[PDB]
A paper describes a structure:
We soaked the AMP crystals with both AMPPNP and 3‐HAA overnight and saw clear density for both molecules. The adenosine and ribose rings of AMPPNP in this complex overlap with their positions in the AMPPNP binary complex. The α‐ and β‐phosphates in the AMPPNP:3‐HAA ternary complex have however shifted and overlap with the β‐ and γ‐phosphates in the AMPPNP. In the AMPPNP:3‐HAA ternary complex, the γ‐phosphate salt bridges to Lys62 and Arg68. The 3‐HAA molecule binds in a pocket adjacent to the AMPPNP positioning one oxygen of the carboxylate group 3.3 Å from the α‐phosphate with an angle of attack of 167° (Ocarboxylate–Pα–Ophosphoanhydride) consistent with adenylation of the carboxylate. Thr239 hydrogen bonds to both α‐phosphate and carboxylate oxygen atoms. The hydroxyl group of 3‐HAA is hydrogen bonded to Glu235 whilst the amino group makes a hydrogen bond to N7 of the adenosine ring. The benzene ring stacks against a stretch of the main chain of Gly237 and Ser238. This complex is model for the Michealis complex of the first half (adenylation) reaction.
We reconstituted the biosynthesis of the benzoxazole moiety found in nataxazole by adding two enzymes ([name], NatAM), to 3‐HAA, ATP, and Mg2+. We have determined the structures of both [name] (homologue of BomJ) and NatAM (homologue of BomN) from the antitumor nataxazole pathway. We show [name] catalyzes ester not, as previously reported, amide formation; the amide is a shunt product. NatAM catalyzes benzoxazole from this ester by a mechanism that we propose involves shuttling of protons to control the fate of a hemiorthoamide intermediate.
Numbering used by the authors:
A (entry chain B): 0 to 436
B (entry chain A): 4 to 436
Write the structure that this text describes.
């Protein structure tokens, strides 16, 4: 290929050709991995892996290995070559570090930008994930810049950008693309309604919503689409340590970006690695210098299939069920978030049920949800019938007043972006002197 | 393309570098709805000489033109969109092409201490609509420094986590406002780390976004072991318009913008003196500004500096310069700040606040036991000696103005969860931040 050194969708015409694209990179990848303290330590007294054939024998890298190596045990280049440093979501007490060169970032930005809806200079792209240490906001911004879209840095979890300000931006800037988790898609819808705007009609320029970071059932995804006027909700799957490892096709399935990484399914019982099936997601990225990973186990429970899709992409599909869990068992029946989510989001759209939570007791499933008063009793009865029909678990279902789970102030409150002030006039509130956020 | 420090050898040469750009700048400004409307049915300004007659652009004009009244290019050419800090009710939009961003990043990167690939740069200003975080990150990337995106006002990045990062990543440079420099020092002590000794790799602290006296700046330096605190002056609408030299004065980046001092009364514009900061950026396409009044109270001087940079210096009073009549006398935040930060460093007085009553100055500050009573008496003597205003000074326990929880609280970065085990807290289901 003229003028580019990493593969694109179309560079292989068969799974045999895809496999050759991968194995060709393994000598470079294996040489780079040995340059890091962690892999140099791992292969100390022995002969290390050097060839594509040697890769079959390579030991898995666990999350706990990355935490033990905090901060730069996994670093394979001089620190002068790093562009950005990031840490994972989850526990603050046991951080996981990731870091990337400028060239590593081109691979990251390309993988995010594989959005079947496209990202164009004509787009105004609201980035509504965090920029605080996590990679998510930086990744969407970098892909927006790569493709020439106007980036509106919404951030998320920032006091500067409450939902009321994000609704105003969505409408007044004619935003065409959003990036945020699926719960944030419903929070934005609720904040729109609280501002007197219909998500299904009053945002005519909004053409797609990019999402990730949560297990997302097709039933919930299609409801999120319907709330926002039937526009595409385009899912990806990623981690701080790997970048984007799978993206949605127009048929609504996520495909693994296998041209940019070797993907394997790990069976905890047998300790075997397969190219498809049910088990834990293992990733060997092929196009990074700073933080080489050999068979890094994300420990996400996944279903990988090589079975063809209506989209015709020559890549396996992946479903992400969730993380390692004991499964929540209520008698002979096993309840998953995924199964309850399907039942909750199968309620008629007219009931406006978006916010809910459940607790597994040994004897009973406790479930609460917000619904407007008129439809609340119908919703409780219909969701009870669904649990009886699909799970047969004992349940205590409670319908709640709006503003109970998601407070009205989260949806409507505006916050001035203040700065430190030390001297105040008599009539001014000096409570904002030093704690001004 | 764009000038560098050293491309001019005299003020006459600097002025020619500026005037050479004005035809292009005046032509670009007329492409925006605002300036096309302003000069409708007239012949517009076209030449460097015509610029002397150009009408000032007020903040209120930018708010009236929200969102894209100031836009001079197709939206396809914009790279990023930003809004100012301050009032949420009346937003001020700014926006930049990729090429506009190279000018922004260059001006921020004019840090006399340098920004190098050997640096680990903690960016501790917001990324939420405001430009501040994005600007420091862009300059870090331009100069090859490892950027650690701390963000600010984010629930993901509390002070306790930022102190842990400062220490464990051997951070060499920080970017945050001056109050945040003291908040990080207080959080460091709460984490068991001495700011003046336990961060040996920290070599400079970059700061902006509030009026900063040299007495306070020198104290912030001393708290962090005597390392340079390097000030700049900027806005969302202009980018960085002035930076500190090694002598500790801010110099205007006049090669990249025409700087004028505005007298509100007469409406007259001078190249130096006391008045409101007016800026014409020279190297932007998306959002041209002709004599944009920041309405910041400034003192501009053409007096030569020991640093040898051929650029005028600027002091920013802003709001900190506006007098409150109390006793017989007029007190400014700037003057009180000098007295508060003239207390001995060993008293650890960093957090304070005052209220101007018609009759008396009410002032509170934190000081640990057992220096609190010395501090109250000494600050009272200083106010008597320097201002002679009546005062009620109260010393407070640490944790009173800046709560211990702000300094020590750790926060897991949770995601939405819908199904919980019996023993788990399900209050984090949908409100997980
Ligand atoms: N589309 C998706 N579907 C399901 N889960 C997803 C999806 N996208 C991301 N995730 C989850 O988010 C994780 C990546 O988040 P990241 O912040 O890197 O780490 P963390 O797992 O939250 N923290 P830690 O366990 O300490 O490593 C993935 O491993 C998945 O568990
Ligand atoms: N070093 C500094 N010293 C003093 N003030 C500063 C300094 N750096 C920035 N500022 C102030 O911060 C302002 C830039 O903040 P910005 O968010 O662009 O606008 P704002 O003035 O807060 N909002 P608005 O009044 O609506 O335009 C400058 O105009 C100054 O008032
Ligand atoms: N969800 C993610 C993604 O899609 C790409 C990169 C990182 C993440 C994440 O959750 O951290
Ligand atoms: N203070 C600032 C700076 O120095 C550069 C750019 C923006 C700002 C700001 O505070 O708005
Ligand atoms: Mg570096
Ligand atoms: Mg692998
Ligand atoms: Mg654009
Ligand atoms: Mg402003
Ligand atoms: Zn498909
Ligand atoms: Zn100087």
């Amino acid at each position: 290929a003229m003028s580019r050194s990493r593969p694109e969708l179309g560079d292989w015409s068969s799974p045999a050709e895809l496999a050759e694209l991968q194995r060709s990179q393994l000598p470079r990848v294996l040489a780079q991995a040995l340059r890091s303290p962690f892999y140099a330590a791992r292969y100390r007294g022995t002969t290390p892996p050097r060839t594509a054939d040697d890769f079959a024998g390579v030991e898995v890298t666990a999350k706990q290995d990355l935490r033990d190596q905090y901060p730069f045990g996994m670093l394979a280049v001089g620190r002068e070559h790093l562009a950005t440093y990031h840490e994972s979501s989850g526990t603050a007490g046991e951080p996981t570090a990731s870091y990337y060169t400028e060239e590593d970032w081109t691979d990251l930005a390309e993988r995010f930008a594989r959005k079947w809806t496209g990202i164009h200079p004509s787009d105004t792209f609201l980035v509504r994930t965090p920029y605080g240490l996590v990679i998510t906001g930086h990744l969407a911004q970098a892909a927006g810049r790569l493709r020439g879209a106007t980036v509106v840095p919404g951030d998320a979890r920032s006091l500067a950008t409450p939902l009321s300000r994000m609704v105003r931006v969505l409408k007044t800037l004619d935003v065409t693309l959003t990036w945020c988790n699926p719960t944030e898609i419903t929070m934005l819808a609720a904040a729109a309604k609280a501002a007197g705007l219909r998500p299904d009609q009053d945002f005519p320029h909004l053409r797609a919503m990019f999402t990730a970071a949560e297990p997302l059932t097709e039933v919930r995804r299609r409801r999120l689409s319907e709330i926002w006027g039937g526009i595409p909700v385009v899912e990806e799957y990623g981690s701080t340590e790997t970048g984007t490892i799978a993206g949605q096709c127009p048929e609504g399935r996520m495909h693994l970006w296998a041209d940019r990484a070797i993907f394997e399914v790990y069976d905890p019982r047998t300790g075997t690695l397969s190219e498809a099936g049910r088990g834990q997601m293992v990733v060997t990225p092929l196009y990074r210098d700073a933080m080489p990973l050999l068979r890094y186990n994300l420990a996400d429970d996944v279903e990988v299939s090589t079975d063809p899709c209506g989209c015709g992409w020559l890549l396996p599909t992946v479903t992400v069920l969730g993380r390692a869990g004991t499964g929540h068992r209520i008698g002979p029946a096993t309840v998953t978030q995924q199964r309850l989510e399907e039942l909750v989001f199968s309620l008629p759209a007219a009931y406006e049920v978006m916010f809910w939570r459940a607790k597994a007791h040994p004897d009973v499933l406790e479930l609460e949800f917000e619904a407007p008063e008129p439809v609340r009793q119908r919703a409780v009865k219909e969701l009870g019938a669904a649990l009886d029909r699909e799970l047969g678990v004992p349940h205590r279902i409670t319908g709640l007043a709006p503003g109970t789970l998601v407070p009205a102030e989260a949806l409507t409150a505006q916050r001035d972006i203040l700065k430190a002030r030390y001297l105040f006039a008599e009539d001014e509130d000096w409570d904002k002197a030093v704690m001004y956020f």
